[PDB]
């Protein structure tokens, strides 16, 4: 169905030693496929997926050059943003940048986004139409004006509605076996009596891709929005994800409760009853 | 591919 390509950039200043630490990662859907770290020995863009290694030397040279340009821009940005906020020279600060694009089932452009942040809070972003900016505080306004003078949004829109979709389509074609797969979760539920009277029923979900899923509890049709605990979806370390949801119930009332799971790899949403 | 246009600082 729908797919996306995303890029994340982080830069943290070290006011006592060396240049700021810079890290970049690239994702297609839920799969990381590329990375760069300024503290590594290679000082090159490195692959992280089997299907991206088909690219030739020119691809890696160009990507390395562009990402080093990114890091230089972040360094200057940290230097300027320190002055813009009247902060001392001894602290450590962070700039974060993220952009990407979406496509639908027809692999046509759907939406794009570009956002900036300083010290963990919003600084400036592009609106939904990709034609005007949104500033958070007064300090951002100056930057907004300058960029409005420099036609930055035109370049960004050209990249987001253009090159981004073409790169995404090429990646989806070259990685059809792994990028377009879907794995239905393996599901089972367990029971644990707490001390003597209450008990907990926990329904799991193992080894599913992609990472978007829904878990719910029902008591004869009653939607249990409360009285249940569910943890954040977590990676397994091999390309799949895990989740579980638990509910505490009086003993002897297990058949009254059921766990419902819906993924996109399931033709029909499931329903689990204890034993 | 990463953004390949003109770079602009804050």
């Amino acid at each position, epitope marked *: 169905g729908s797919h996306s390509m995303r890029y994340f950039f982080t830069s943290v200043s070290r006011p006592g030693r060396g240049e700021p630490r810079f890290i970049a990662v690239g994702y297609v859907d839920d799969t990381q496929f590329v990375r760069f770290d300024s503290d590594a020995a290679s000082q090159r863009m490195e692959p992280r997926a089997p299907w991206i290694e088909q690219e030739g030397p020119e691809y890696w040279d160009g990507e390395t050059r*562009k990402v080093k340009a990114h890091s230089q821009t972040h360094r200057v940005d940290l230097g300027t943003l320190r002055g813009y906020y009247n902060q001392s020279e001894a602290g450590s600060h962070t700039v974060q940048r993220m952009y990407g694009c979406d496509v639908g089932s027809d692999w046509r452009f759907l939406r794009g986004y570009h956002q900036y942040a300083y010290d963990g809070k919003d600084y400036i972003a592009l609106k939904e139409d990709l034609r005007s900016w949104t500033a958070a505080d007064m300090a951002a306004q100056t930057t907004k004006h300058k960029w409005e003078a420099a036609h930055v949004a035109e370049q960004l829109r050209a990249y987001l509605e*253009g*090159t981004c979709v073409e790169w995404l389509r090429r990646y989806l074609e070259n990685g059809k076996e792994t990028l377009q797969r879907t794995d239905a979760p393996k599901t089972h539920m367990t029971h644990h009596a707490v001390s003597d009277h209450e008990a907990t029923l926990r329904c799991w979900a193992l080894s599913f891709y992609p990472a978007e899923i829904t878990l719910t509890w029902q008591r004869d049709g009653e939607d249990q929005t409360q009285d249940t605990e569910l943890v954040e979806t977590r990676p397994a370390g091999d390309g799949t994800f895990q989740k579980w949801a638990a509910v505490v119930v009086p003993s002897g009332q297990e058949q009254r409760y059921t766990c419902h799971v819906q993924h996109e790899g399931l033709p029909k949403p499931l329903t689990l009853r204890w034993e | *591919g990463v953004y390949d246009g*003109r770079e602009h600082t804050v």
Partner: T-cell receptor
């Protein structure tokens, strides 16, 4: 606004020749081109930005220097007869989005024995 | 990433429209096409630019472009030709830098002569 040092030059073989190119638009990319009859434009050298440089398809016999942002110097170490041509300098922003090259008026150079 | 202008030399009567042809091929996801005019003085004058991801053709004064991405052609159209249009015209392309080379590539050149 791109300016080259001279418009006409005549030199003797064996001399060291200097060619200058200055722009004031605060452009990153700079290029040195050579024009010959029936051969079109051929790139000698180009520079992404300050202090870095890369060879073109005919870099033999020339050297370059990009110590500054707004200057791109070309040097002929030993002038030879087969270096008689017209030389052009260009500058532009980075990337393919509405970024054409901006040429100067050119410099015609003749090397005689 | 290469450009070819097949036809050397064109002739046109004054107060008439003429078309100069240019065909390109590339695999770079992002690129732009653009045209120059060089008179007898020897300078290069920028005429028109068009990217690969914009609807409509670029128009500027008497200069327009016939851009066919499907068959990879970027033809330059001159309307109401004048005597001062006799020059050498160049077709050029540049790319993003990861799907191909970064340095611009130029066409061979096409000469245009206007007759009174």
């Amino acid at each position: 606004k791109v300016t080259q040092s001279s418009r006409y030059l005549v030199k003797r073989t064996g001399e060291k020749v200097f060619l200058e190119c200055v722009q004031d638009m605060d452009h990153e990319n700079m290029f040195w081109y050579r024009q010959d009859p029936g051969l079109g434009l051929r790139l000698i050298y180009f520079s992404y930005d300050v202090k870095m440089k890369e060879k073109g398809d005919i870099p033999e016999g020339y050297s370059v220097s990009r110590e500054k942002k707004e200057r791109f110097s070309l040097i002929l170490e030993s002038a030879s007869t087969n270096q008689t041509s017209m030389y052009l300098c260009a500058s532009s922003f980075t990337g393919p989005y509405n970024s054409p090259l901006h040429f100067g008026n050119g410099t015609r150079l003749t090397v005689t024995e | 990433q290469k450009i070819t202008q097949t036809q050397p030399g064109m002739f046109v009567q004054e107060k008439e429209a003429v078309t100069l042809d240019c065909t390109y091929d590339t695999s770079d996801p992002s690129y732009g096409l653009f045209w120059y005019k060089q008179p007898s003085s020897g300078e290069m004058i920028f005429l028109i630019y068009q990217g690969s991801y914009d609807q409509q053709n670029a128009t500027e004064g008497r200069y327009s472009l016939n851009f066919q991405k499907a068959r990879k052609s970027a033809n330059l159209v001159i309307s109401a030709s004048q005597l001062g249009d006799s020059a050498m015209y160049f077709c050029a392309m540049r790319g993003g830098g990861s799907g191909g080379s970064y340095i611009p590539t130029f066409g061979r050149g096409t000469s245009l002569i206007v007759h009174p």
